Amino acid sequence: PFVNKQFNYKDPVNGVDIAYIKIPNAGQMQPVKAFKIHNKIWVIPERDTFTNPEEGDLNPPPEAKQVPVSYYDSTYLSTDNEKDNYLKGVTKLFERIYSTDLGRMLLTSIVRGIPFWGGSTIDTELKVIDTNCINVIQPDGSYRSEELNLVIIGPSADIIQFECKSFGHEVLNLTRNGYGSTQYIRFSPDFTFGFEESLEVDTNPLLGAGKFATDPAVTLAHQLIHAGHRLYGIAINPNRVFKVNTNAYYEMSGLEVSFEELRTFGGHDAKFIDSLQENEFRLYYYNKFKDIASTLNKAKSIVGTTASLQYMKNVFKEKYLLSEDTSGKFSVDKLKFDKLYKMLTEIYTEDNFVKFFKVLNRKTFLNFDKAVFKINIVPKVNYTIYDGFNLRNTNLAANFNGQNTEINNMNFTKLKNFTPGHHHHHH
């Protein structure tokens, strides 16, 4: 959310909001410098070769094996100067998101979305799950474990493959049982995608469609919406998909977009989602929340040194908006639940963010990107918190001229065209 202090990648470690950390994952990775820009939210301006053991390096696949919509450069984000621009880029997008009524609400929901303390084998004991924390390095080289909700980190080998990922449990499906888990969003504020479009009326495309660029704040908001679903454990299994056409057959080929995506993008694309199935999930998650309420009600002990049981129960009471009856027993407030669920699944959408931002964006999640563009959003003369690329009092404020890649050509440097025309990428 709003970032109170101005961080520089150079600033010294203070073990509080600027430190070296290790991600709770697998091998003996070497620490990396990280910045806590808001309660529970961290930014690691490094390439992600930690979240997945199958991606320990930045070696690009052979050319013949590369997806049409992909971009590789083992060198991006490897110098302090890039990291510093990464950090300020991400921070500025958070402020742009936070600056809208919709984004302020989403970020508030994300910060209150502490992953549940369901890591004990004893059913009456609350204990944090290790993969929902990071190890902050102390002055004396020792590691101090800290809980967090979100981490913004650089992309893996393919630079434009953005996504929201998290560590799993050996038996619990944290993203789908109402528990939630720390979310790691692979993202870069240094590149954006170009698309075609041009809102017209009846008869006139002599010059062809305009060539525009996607505002990075929308691309980040998209990932954060996924994070919202997952922090609250109400994500939908990606194998659950819906066919999106006409003239096509099922089997889930031709065109079947996952339920998760259609709901995240929203707008005209959220009408292809089966209402009943949608209704079933809300009931299923409402129940998951009820189970959590009983777990809290039956809790007799807690693991950890600083936090007291009552303290944690209250943390979760605020998260899941539970009712605390006349006897102290927690219950799921149907009124408050419905609202929370609705907000998380249908108010927080890419479509709605596009409205608040007043930007041009693909109309249907089913649009095709044409190219990748190098950009630099840090300079206030290139991009602002309130206008993005369509700077006011310049010829960039009308007709999304700021997003137009021909007009505002000094703000977009093409790195590659996506040769085939047909498929997707995603998010």
* List of residues contacting Zn ion (CB under 5 A): 264, 427
3-state secondary structure at position 226: helix
**Nearest-angstrom CA–CA distance, 407 and 401:** 6
Find where tokens 């470690």 sit: 13
Q: Cβ 178 to Zn ion, closest distance in Å?
A: 21
Nearer to Zn ion by Cβ, of 162 and 285: the residue is 162
> Is the Cβ–Cβ distance between 196 and 210 less than 8 Å?
yes
E strand map for 161-316:
163-165, 183-186, 191-197, 210-213, 241-243, 256-258, 301-302
Exposure of 65 by Cβ count < 10 A (0-12 exposed, 13-18 middle, 19+ buried)? exposed
Nearer to Zn ion by Cβ, of 88 and 427: the residue is 427
- The closest of 423, 357, 352 to 389, measured between CA atoms, is 357
How many residues are listed for the chain in this entry?
Answer: 427
Q: Cβ 323 to Zn ion, closest distance in Å?
A: 33
CB atoms < 10 A from the CB of 46, how many? Answer: 16
The C-alpha angle 174, 179, 184, rounded to 5 degrees, equals 60
Q: Which amino acid is at 207?
A: L
Nearer to Zn ion by Cβ, of 109 and 264: the residue is 264
Q: Cβ 226 to Zn ion, closest distance in Å?
A: 6
Q: Cβ 369 to Zn ion, closest distance in Å?
A: 14
**Nearest-angstrom CA–CA distance, 293 and 376:** 46
Q: Cβ 261 to Zn ion, closest distance in Å?
A: 5
Nearer to Zn ion by Cβ, of 313 and 427: the residue is 427
Nearer to Zn ion by Cβ, of 114 and 257: the residue is 257
Q: Cβ 352 to Zn ion, closest distance in Å?
A: 14
Whose CB is nearest to Zn ion?
Answer: 427
Nearer to Zn ion by Cβ, of 220 and 292: the residue is 220
